[PDB]
Amino acid sequence: SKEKITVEIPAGSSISDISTILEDKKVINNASIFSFYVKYNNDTNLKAGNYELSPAMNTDQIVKKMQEGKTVAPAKLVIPEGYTLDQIADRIVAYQPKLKKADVLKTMDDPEFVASMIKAYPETVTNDVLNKSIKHPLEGYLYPATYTFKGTDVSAEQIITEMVKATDVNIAKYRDELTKQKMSVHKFLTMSSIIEKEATENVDRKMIASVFYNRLAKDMRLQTDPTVLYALGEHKSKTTYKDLEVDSPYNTYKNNGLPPGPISNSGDSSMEAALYPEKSDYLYFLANKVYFSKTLEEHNKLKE
Amino acid sequence: SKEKITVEIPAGSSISDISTILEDKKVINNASIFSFYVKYNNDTNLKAGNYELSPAMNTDQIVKKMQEGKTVAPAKLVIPEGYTLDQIADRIVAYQPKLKKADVLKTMDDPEFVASMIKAYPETVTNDVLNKSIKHPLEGYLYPATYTFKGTDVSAEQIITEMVKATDVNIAKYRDELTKQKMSVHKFLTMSSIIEKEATENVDRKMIASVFYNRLAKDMRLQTDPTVLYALGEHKSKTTYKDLEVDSPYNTYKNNGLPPGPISNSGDSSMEAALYPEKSDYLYFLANKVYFSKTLEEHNKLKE
Amino acid sequence: SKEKITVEIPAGSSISDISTILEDKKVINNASIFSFYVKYNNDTNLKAGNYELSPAMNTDQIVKKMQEGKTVAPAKLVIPEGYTLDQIADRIVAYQPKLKKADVLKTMDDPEFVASMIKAYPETVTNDVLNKSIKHPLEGYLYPATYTFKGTDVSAEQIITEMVKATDVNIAKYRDELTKQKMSVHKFLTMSSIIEKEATENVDRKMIASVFYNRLAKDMRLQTDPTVLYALGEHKSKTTYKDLEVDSPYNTYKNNGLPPGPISNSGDSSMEAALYPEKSDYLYFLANKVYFSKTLEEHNKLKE
Amino acid sequence: SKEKITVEIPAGSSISDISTILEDKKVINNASIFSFYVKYNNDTNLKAGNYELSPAMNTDQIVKKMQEGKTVAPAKLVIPEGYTLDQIADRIVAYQPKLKKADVLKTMDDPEFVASMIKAYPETVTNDVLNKSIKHPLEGYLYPATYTFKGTDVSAEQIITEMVKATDVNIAKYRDELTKQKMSVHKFLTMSSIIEKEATENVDRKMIASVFYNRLAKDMRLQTDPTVLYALGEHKSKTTYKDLEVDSPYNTYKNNGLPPGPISNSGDSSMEAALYPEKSDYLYFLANTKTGKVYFSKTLEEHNKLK
Amino acid sequence: SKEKITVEIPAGSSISDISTILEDKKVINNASIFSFYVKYNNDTNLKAGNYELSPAMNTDQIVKKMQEGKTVAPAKLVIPEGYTLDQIADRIVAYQPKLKKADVLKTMDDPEFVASMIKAYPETVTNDVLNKSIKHPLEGYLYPATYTFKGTDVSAEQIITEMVKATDVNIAKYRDELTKQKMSVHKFLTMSSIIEKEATENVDRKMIASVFYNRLAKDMRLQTDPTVLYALGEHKSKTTYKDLEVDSPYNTYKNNGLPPGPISNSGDSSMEAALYPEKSDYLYFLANTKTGKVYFSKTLEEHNKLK
Amino acid sequence: SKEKITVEIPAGSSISDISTILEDKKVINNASIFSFYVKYNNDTNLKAGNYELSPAMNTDQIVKKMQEGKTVAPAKLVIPEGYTLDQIADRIVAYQPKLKKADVLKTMDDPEFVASMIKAYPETVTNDVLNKSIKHPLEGYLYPATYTFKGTDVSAEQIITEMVKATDVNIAKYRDELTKQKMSVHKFLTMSSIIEKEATENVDRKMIASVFYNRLAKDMRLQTDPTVLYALGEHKSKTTYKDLEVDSPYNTYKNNGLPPGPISNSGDSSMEAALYPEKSDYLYFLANTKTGKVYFSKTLEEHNKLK
Ligand SMILES: [Cl-]
Ligand SMILES: [Cl-]
Ligand SMILES: [Cl-]
Ligand SMILES: [Cl-]
Ligand SMILES: [Cl-]
Ligand SMILES: [Cl-]
Ligand SMILES: [Cl-]
Ligand SMILES: [Cl-]
Ligand SMILES: [Cl-]
Ligand SMILES: [Cl-]
Structure with missing residues (x-):
């Protein structure tokens, strides 16, 4: 509700980039592990843009929100x-x-x-x-x-x-x-x-x-x-x-x-x-x- | 649809071989991690042949397609x-x-x-x-x-x-x-x-x-x-x-x-x-x- | 069916022991990874005894069969x-x-x-x-x-x-x-x-x-x-x-x-x-x- | 003999921050594996600044430059x-x-x-x-x-x-x-x-x-x-x-x-x-x-x- | 004293490519673990070509031959x-x-x-x-x-x-x-x-x-x-x-x-x-x-x- | 000064086999981690036989004894x-x-x-x-x-x-x-x-x-x-x-x-x-x-x- 955190994913962001923005913003605890989740499930089609996320939001709910591109501001x-x-x-x-x-x-x-x-x-x-x-x-x-x-x-x-x-x-x-x-x-x-x-x-x-x-x-x-x-x-x-x-x-x-x-x-x-x-x-x-x-x-x- | 990638799995291919072909062809991001998925779930009965796959196709959908042998050309x-x-x-x-x-x-x-x-x-x-x-x-x-x-x-x-x-x-x-x-x-x-x-x-x-x-x-x-x-x-x-x-x-x-x-x-x-x-x-x-x-x-x- | 493999788990077997017997017998590919699965899911209550298993049997089906103790010969x-x-x-x-x-x-x-x-x-x-x-x-x-x-x-x-x-x-x-x-x-x-x-x-x-x-x-x-x-x-x-x-x-x-x-x-x-x-x-x-x-x-x- | 890539580590950068900049700049291949190296060896004292690194540069050297803070010294x-x-x-x-x-x-x-x-x-x-x-x-x-x-x-x-x-x-x-x-x-x-x-x-x-x-x-x-x-x-x-x-x-x-x-x-x-x-x-x-x-x-x- | 296996690394081979050829040729046991070694140490400058490797050959030596490109030199x-x-x-x-x-x-x-x-x-x-x-x-x-x-x-x-x-x-x-x-x-x-x-x-x-x-x-x-x-x-x-x-x-x-x-x-x-x-x-x-x-x-x- | 545990590695033992015997005998703590060491360093040439190992014995020494095959030599x-x-x-x-x-x-x-x-x-x-x-x-x-x-x-x-x-x-x-x-x-x-x-x-x-x-x-x-x-x-x-x-x-x-x-x-x-x-x-x-x-x-x- 008021626990929302707005993250910004620039266009062309690698999986490490995304993972690190998520850790920097305190949505997740560890960038490496999120990178591992993404590659393990092969959920690499993440859309750039700005998202409203919260801490302790399940990893799959996060990834799914990014795969569907349900942003608050579009990719730039x-x-x-x-x-x-x-x-x-x-x-x-x-x-x-x-x-x-x-x-x-x-x-x-x-x-x-x-x-x-x-x-x-x-x-x-x-x-x-x-x-x-x-x-x-x-x-x-x-x-x-x-x-x-x-x-x-x-x-x-x-x-x-x-x-x-x-x-x-x-x-x-x-x-x-x-x-x-x-x-x-x-x-x-x-x-x-x-x-x-x-x-x-x-x-x-x-x-x-x-x-x-x-x-x-x-x-x-x-x-x-x-x-x-x-x-x-x-x-x-x-x-x-x-x-x-x-x-x-x-x-x-x-x-x-x-x-x-x-x-x-x-x-x-x-x-x-x-x-x-x-x-x-x-x-x-x-x-x-x-x-x-x-x-x-x-x-x-x-x-010279 | 038009995002299909055709991969070829030769007969006798090891799990590493399969994983590496998938990475070479850009279906997945990391061969090691796919190898890990396969061995972790014990899905080692992958059928050789040629498959039509796409990027960001969920790892389990890929493995399942290979376990069922749903190929476009049979194993050689x-x-x-x-x-x-x-x-x-x-x-x-x-x-x-x-x-x-x-x-x-x-x-x-x-x-x-x-x-x-x-x-x-x-x-x-x-x-x-x-x-x-x-x-x-x-x-x-x-x-x-x-x-x-x-x-x-x-x-x-x-x-x-x-x-x-x-x-x-x-x-x-x-x-x-x-x-x-x-x-x-x-x-x-x-x-x-x-x-x-x-x-x-x-x-x-x-x-x-x-x-x-x-x-x-x-x-x-x-x-x-x-x-x-x-x-x-x-x-x-x-x-x-x-x-x-x-x-x-x-x-x-x-x-x-x-x-x-x-x-x-x-x-x-x-x-x-x-x-x-x-x-x-x-x-x-x-x-x-x-x-x-x-x-x-x-x-x-x-x-001499 | 005729693809069955009979494994023997002695009483008092550690998780590594079980994992290694499974690899020795070709039921699974890698002992470490099975150990990881067990500890990750906290499925440590595996029953000793003899089991009829097959290769490429899903890891969870294997673990579940061992947790329920569905053996062909009891623990010794x-x-x-x-x-x-x-x-x-x-x-x-x-x-x-x-x-x-x-x-x-x-x-x-x-x-x-x-x-x-x-x-x-x-x-x-x-x-x-x-x-x-x-x-x-x-x-x-x-x-x-x-x-x-x-x-x-x-x-x-x-x-x-x-x-x-x-x-x-x-x-x-x-x-x-x-x-x-x-x-x-x-x-x-x-x-x-x-x-x-x-x-x-x-x-x-x-x-x-x-x-x-x-x-x-x-x-x-x-x-x-x-x-x-x-x-x-x-x-x-x-x-x-x-x-x-x-x-x-x-x-x-x-x-x-x-x-x-x-x-x-x-x-x-x-x-x-x-x-x-x-x-x-x-x-x-x-x-x-x-x-x-x-x-x-x-x-x-x-x-002397 | 070797190609030199200048990378910039901003003040207050976390280990993930650093790893990802290295990967972005193609000095290393994988940000995760680098984070693991840093934590395993406990080389967390990495100084912010500008560094001249090379791809394929042994991980130990990379980390050692940042620890010591051997940053880019302008000629003029x-x-x-x-x-x-x-x-x-x-x-x-x-x-x-x-x-x-x-x-x-x-x-x-x-x-x-x-x-x-x-x-x-x-x-x-x-x-x-x-x-x-x-x-x-x-x-x-x-x-x-x-x-x-x-x-x-x-x-x-x-x-x-x-x-x-x-x-x-x-x-x-x-x-x-x-x-x-x-x-x-x-x-x-x-x-x-x-x-x-x-x-x-x-x-x-x-x-x-x-x-x-x-x-x-x-x-x-x-x-x-x-x-x-x-x-x-x-x-x-x-x-x-x-x-x-x-x-x-x-x-x-x-x-x-x-x-x-x-x-x-x-x-x-x-x-x-x-x-x-x-x-x-x-x-x-x-x-x-x-x-x-x-x-x-x-x-x-x-x-x-x-x- | 040791058995020699000749392996061939084609031009443009990725790290996974190389790891898997080594495993195929039985020089190493596990392609993943080798890929991790290469990335961890940041030894990504591996030259294409023909090499004479031995099984059980320490990973460092393998990688070191490929880095330096010490390939098979024909006698004639x-x-x-x-x-x-x-x-x-x-x-x-x-x-x-x-x-x-x-x-x-x-x-x-x-x-x-x-x-x-x-x-x-x-x-x-x-x-x-x-x-x-x-x-x-x-x-x-x-x-x-x-x-x-x-x-x-x-x-x-x-x-x-x-x-x-x-x-x-x-x-x-x-x-x-x-x-x-x-x-x-x-x-x-x-x-x-x-x-x-x-x-x-x-x-x-x-x-x-x-x-x-x-x-x-x-x-x-x-x-x-x-x-x-x-x-x-x-x-x-x-x-x-x-x-x-x-x-x-x-x-x-x-x-x-x-x-x-x-x-x-x-x-x-x-x-x-x-x-x-x-x-x-x-x-x-x-x-x-x-x-x-x-x-x-x-x-x-x-x-x-x-x- | 140190306690000695004799372990037996049967002929044809796989790496998992060896790791698990070491863990069973309490020479090492974790069989997986030992298997990873062996594969990472590519020290797969481990000889079968009887060895006198000590707990807390550095992993490198353990592996080095098995590679060289420095087994238990009977006094008589x-x-x-x-x-x-x-x-x-x-x-x-x-x-x-x-x-x-x-x-x-x-x-x-x-x-x-x-x-x-x-x-x-x-x-x-x-x-x-x-x-x-x-x-x-x-x-x-x-x-x-x-x-x-x-x-x-x-x-x-x-x-x-x-x-x-x-x-x-x-x-x-x-x-x-x-x-x-x-x-x-x-x-x-x-x-x-x-x-x-x-x-x-x-x-x-x-x-x-x-x-x-x-x-x-x-x-x-x-x-x-x-x-x-x-x-x-x-x-x-x-x-x-x-x-x-x-x-x-x-x-x-x-x-x-x-x-x-x-x-x-x-x-x-x-x-x-x-x-x-x-x-x-x-x-x-x-x-x-x-x-x-x-x-x-x-x-x-x-x-x-x-x-
Ligand atoms: Cl953490
Ligand atoms: Cl990757
Ligand atoms: Cl394996
Ligand atoms: Cl997992
Ligand atoms: Cl999972
Ligand atoms: Cl990578
Ligand atoms: Cl293996
Ligand atoms: Cl290590
Ligand atoms: Cl190390
Ligand atoms: Cl442990």
Whole structure:
């Protein structure tokens, strides 16, 4: 009654994770033993979410409540900012384990599914996503936020649709300014993503933005590493010299202008940054504390 | 529904084997714990075969499905080529564990059971198997292949009968050529078995056959080791000099001609080899790469 | 049906013992795990006896069959020869665990129970057992043999009564010879017990008997160690010099003649020995091979 | 030769907590079996912190590192913006483990140590820091940067001195403007700090600064939460109502003007804002408790409306 | 003194997989208890391969051999027929563990190493191996036999040289026939190889050879699967339809003639077949996907009928 | 300082078997936990035999003794009555472990060793032992007693010699009677042995002896089971019907007279019986398969009636 304890099970939680949350919250006495019960009975299909449980509630009543998903708040699909479709796919299958990563990736790039989004969100997803130079059409169109779903075994299509919708809803406030600058949504999101992937912790994004706009204006290549990493389709730390020679239109070391599309989704500061850049004469920047230099010399003479 | 996983349990699988296949296939989380469940409840009578299972299927529902043998494909009794009745008996009891090896061996050599085969497969099993010099009448008559059975607790007689039948069915294609060369089935199978036991991996069986026919024709003893090993009734690696003195009609070091019967069952290449030997003047061969020498000298001068 | 396995559980078997017999006989796969099941469910009241069990019989069906005592042959109370009432009491409580040793010992020496035996078996248990010099009246009257009982929670009185009855039944054959030599049952059993406790493995009991009769006849004390050990009420190996001074009528080092009664029950050879001693002039003997010497000197000069 | 996984064990973590983090991070295979090891051997004295572990690392070694507390020692001493002396003390202890937190705090506030700084950097640290109402004299005077030391048992005094020197060196460019506006280094760093703690990453700090100056010129209290939190010497995110009543000169809800000194150190961004604010009519500001987008409103009603 | 059981741990085997193989092979008694040992001690870095273990061998030793990967080192280097340079590279590494697979492959294809062979064995390895269209110049030139080396850190070059020398020595008997038919050693070894990969043990290779020659004389492509598999540098059993479309001069479904070079080494049986085929009218052949009995049919219809 | 418990591990004991005997004997507390230790460490090579263990003895030591087979070594070599050479061989090996059973048996039957005994003890071991029909020449000639040896690696020959010497010394008292009855030492020891194996402890051996002599004088076969069992070289309790048909001169069901030699050694009791039997008309005897009380009946019917 008033002896209730509210536990929170994040999406993608292992059996040990669940067991340990239950012990931390005093619902059960020993995490190992609960893990043993689960594996012994093969009750591994536990649903994430928030549950109202009580101490000395029989182990089977607990497990059964979790297998039936009788929650007080649903499981949370958290999609962070700076994520590629591939990374988002990892989260989706960790959240809805009956889905397989290869199928989710197939749906995201499916011509018929992509066309449905173009039709359903015409002012956000346009024919621009169909450029043959783009690797994955919806890259950058799945918005960073937490999502929940009421259905059972929800499809990858339903899940992805909500992430496109959130993008449509959340950039509505930027729409008049996009029209004022005659900037397509696609380019807006492209610029935001390159700003997103370079932006450190507390670094000023509006300055980073100004460096990229300044370079576009003077016909200098953006020479931004996260685009090369994206072309090679990998989420690694550094980029070697051999990587700088990757033959891809996303390679901003060998191609002038913005890449064919975004390389990830973006946060609001990166979006504000793209639309309202700072006015400066900076053409270079180095990350870690971020030093903006305005000449060829100052930058090269600012190593170590 | 579409969440089904097909698992395959080979005949003779231990509890650990079963447990591990279940973990490999993602039906259960932990092999040790399933092993523990089985032994704790004493549910050790699990039937081999193929099952349609799903993840998070309760452990008892899994075990119960395996105890009742509710399979999508039956258990497979695999009898390899080059096997003696004794080895086949090992497989039979591993496949149908309510049978005891001593009883299976008794049935194989039972006068009344042997006579029934002579009557049921008259063109394959003839009075030749009744020669008092033969150790085990049906040696070589149980064909190498995979067998399945629908009945419950099938008798050793039913099982053995099918292996005799398969021999009858599969040598039907060689029957006209046997008549053409006036070669009894018994001798055909005898020759095939000695070819089978000498044949290495990729060695040419038709040459080995020609050496044995050449020796028969010149009244030389076959001097083939697997026959001595057979006489001593053991499945060992080497044959010592004291073994070469075993007093048995199967001993081709002390008796001229083919032994009284086969020393094992044979594959199709060994059978083709027996009926269609190569024409050559080779009288010796040494195994490991197989070198055929055509004179007394060349062989002795080809050691190490 | 024909898959039955007969297991034998001796009286006094621990849980490990039971578990191990079940594994040895192939009824279960693992003794430890069965032990775990028993202790986990607290099903420790398993009845000894012989059971018809089968492999893959569910653990609970096995335990339940043993808790209900549904045996094919009852539990065996084995009483060996050369046992004191105290040792017999150990066996009784190990066989019928609801009884307590202190109560069983109380019943054995109870005046009213002793009198009932005198009344029920008048030609075997007589007033001689009431001599105030006797430590335990029925000492030696409980016969060595295996006993079984059909009742539930049988009383110590019922159990002891059967051991007195067996003595009455089994010495019936010696009765005419006892009358011929005018030897009371009490003395007969007393002599048998001292012969029983000295008798080694293959030593001749009729010679030992003759030494004790020879000593009685010449008024020499029997000087037999097991009587001193009995007086001190202990089942130990050796007897120190301080033990030889125990002030008890059972002490045959300080009292002439037979002790007041038996110091244990006896086997048939010891009984035959008491009634039909050998004729000799031996007055001493030393145990280990047993050397009988006929003079004071020969014995003392036969150490080490 | 081996791959290194950094794991973090939070303070107050139970044995199950630790086991499960190891399994999550793929250093061990099974959290239960690890819990059993710890209990069986009775190795329950496991220290919280950051460790560099390897998968397949023998269980004994893992446990032995946590028992002894052989945690990740940073190659360099990094001091970020918006940090108080207490937090700097942590980064210092983490970097030079032979030093104890209590001593480093004492050195910071040691009258003789503070007097030596007033003597060594007279243009930067002046008698202003000795004002009776200041909690910690050098609060705000240890510059945010990356420092390294050649020495072996580097003392807290040596380290702190390098941070005070960095401040002195790095504000040299603002000297001319400070002299022109007649703003003391102390009031300068005070504004900078209240600006620093109120700005999310991308916020326009020059507007935040203008609000404060506007309030200051209009005799309106600054009412900035970070100053309340600093008053309580507490590193939390939100302030309660009871906190707003705290008796302290640092409480800008109860006192007009700037607090007696800075509440943290500041980045160049904030320093520029302090000296070069924007000329505007804004007197209120609110950052979304979601996006971190700062909205400046001219009047009290406009501000309240944003709930 | 002790009995030795060889166990095989396949690549990608889980801990349960390993435990159960040990129990199956009777090296340990209980797979569960072994899994627990591995997890408790955190000895999860167990290398795949072949090991010589003994029953009753202390658990620590077992695990220690697998961790260190102290696998069965063959006394001799055996190279069977039908092997490609990649497979020879494995047998070499297994035999001389100090050598790495990547280097052995590089040596095989090293322009300077190949030129040295053309110089050392001029009657056997000629400029033919330097044809632009060949994947690996020495493919087919390393003879199948058993080799042994007295040396200590025998180099890949020494080893490969002995195999090339064996080829040179062992084809000496075919020289006279090659000269008479004017068949280069290179085309000789090419035929031999396509014959080798198409014959089950007992099949009549001289008929297989006649089919190929017949097709060759009739301008019919050889359409032999093994050449397609070799084109993909893949050691599988069956070829899919997508594989038959692979763009490569080695693809005998898309190009007439023999491939640019051999696809493996060959046994004497195949070599005889190449030089002494049977005179016949067969143009197709099919081996049972069951018995391995090869059926030669004269026409296209007769062939198709065997499904 | 410590209490010692002797435990016995029978041949073919499983790990559970061993664990449970240890628990029964109170050397360990819990059979399960011990089984787990054995399996976890993979110490499954536990030798059968008799061990002196102590309670609280560290588990590792217990297991280590059984692995190495460091069993209870008797201080002295005791040879009881009714023992055959095979059984004596066991007592010898148990006492002097460096010796192997197969060698001790060979020495016993070694022609040169036997000839040396015929030479060293000519009054006792004569050419009679070399009779073609005897299984083991010295069967019955190794006296039952307790022996001890000062030597270090005492040989089987030295040991056997002492037992043959004991026989020679200890039958000296019967010499005069043997000469008077003209009974060879060999027939003497033969009777003694068949008398020995047929007597329970307290049975009157002089009556058993009279039966045999009576049968012998009446040309009735002795039909004594122990001779049949000895014929089969088997140490069992009961003889089956198939055993009674065994082809051997030792089989007294198929041959008249005494067997070719003794079937074991004998105690003085049996020896006296052989030389001084009782004069009686008994021709049959039966010992209860319960009490071991021997009943002698004069005729065939009286005997059969006792079923
Ligand atoms: Cl607990
Ligand atoms: Cl697990
Ligand atoms: Cl087991
Ligand atoms: Cl349980
Ligand atoms: Cl349960
Ligand atoms: Cl696990
Ligand atoms: Cl086991
Ligand atoms: Cl442990
Ligand atoms: Cl341990
Ligand atoms: Cl316990």
